[PDB]
Curated annotation (Swiss-Prot):
Keywords: NADP, One-carbon metabolism, Oxidoreductase. PANTHER family: DIHYDROFOLATE REDUCTASE. The keyword Membrane does not apply. The keyword Cytoplasm does not apply. It is an enzyme of class 1 (oxidoreductase). Residues 1-156 form the DHFR domain. Key enzyme in folate metabolism. Catalyzes an essential reaction for de novo glycine and purine synthesis, and for DNA precursor synthesis. The gene is folA. Pathway: Cofactor biosynthesis; tetrahydrofolate biosynthesis; 5,6,7,8-tetrahydrofolate from 7,8-dihydrofolate: step 1/1. Disulfide bonds: none annotated. This is Dihydrofolate reductase. NADP(+) binds at residues 6-7, 14-19, 43-46, 62-65, 92-97, 100, 121. It comes from Staphylococcus aureus.
Length: 157
């Protein structure tokens, strides 16, 4: 399976100055749940902002940099390389990866952040005419998660 994994706000903002615009532990928890034991594919900028591979899953980084060789990370240099990765592969961002892959993935796990943040990077526009809502779950708010959010699983029609 090839899946997109993303959190975007009401205007499809996904990032600002190479960081997430919001603080949402429940979403990080869900990312961990979804991707542990599987594969994350991310663009070079997204990887550098995280700064190290995420534990207990395969980390794959797409870059044109022939010098890229980071411990605990597998490097690929072409979009086509993604299709050779075994198992459940999650496209983990950032904007360039989402734009390059949104027309190819099987399904999308999207956390809709119900706010309007300042952003400089975006998830591409999409229509629910193309995607079935397999599930939609309101995130629980608390002291540490204070922005309303909804977990979607969308499957291509
Ligand atoms: N909200 C979310 O769910 C989420 C998730 C992930 C990321 N983000 C955000 O997304 C933003 C970053 O997105 P971005 O578009 O600026 O960068 P990005 O997609 O993370 O990385 C871009 C880089 O990926 C490499 N790349 C992409 N396509 C390639 C291809 N076909 N062949 C070879 N290399 C390729 C290139 O690296 P080289 O220049 O090294 O060749 C390119 O410069 C950040 O703000 C981050 O916080 C948000
Ligand atoms: C966790 C935010 C997020 N949510 C969803 N639903 N899908 C995604 N693809 C990403 C993402 C991402 C990239 C990213 C992750 C992290 C990050 C932070 C904490 C944890 C963790 O505690 O597990 C994991 C990833 C940090 C920066 C960063 O880019 C700036």
């Amino acid at each position: 399976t090839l899946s997109i994994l993303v959190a975007h706000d009401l205007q499809r903002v996904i990032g600002f100055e190479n960081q997430l615009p919001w603080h949402l532990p429940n979403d990080l928890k869900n990312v961990k749940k979804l991707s542990t034991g599987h594969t994350l594919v991310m663009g070079r900028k997204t990887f550098e902002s995280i700064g190290k591979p995420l534990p207990n899953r395969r980390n794959v980084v797409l870059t044109s940099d022939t010098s890229f060789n980071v411990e605990g990370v597998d490097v690929i240099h072409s979009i086509e390389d993604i299709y050779q990765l075994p198992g459940h592969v999650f496209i983990f961002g950032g904007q360039t990866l989402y734009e390059e892959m949104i027309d190819k993935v099987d399904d999308m796990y999207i956390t809709v952040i119900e706010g309007k943040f300042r952003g400089d990077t975006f998830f591409p526009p999409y229509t629910f005419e193309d995607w079935e809502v397999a599930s939609s779950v309101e995130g629980k708010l608390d002291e540490k998660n204070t922005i309303p959010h909804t977990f979607l699983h969308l499957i291509r029609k």
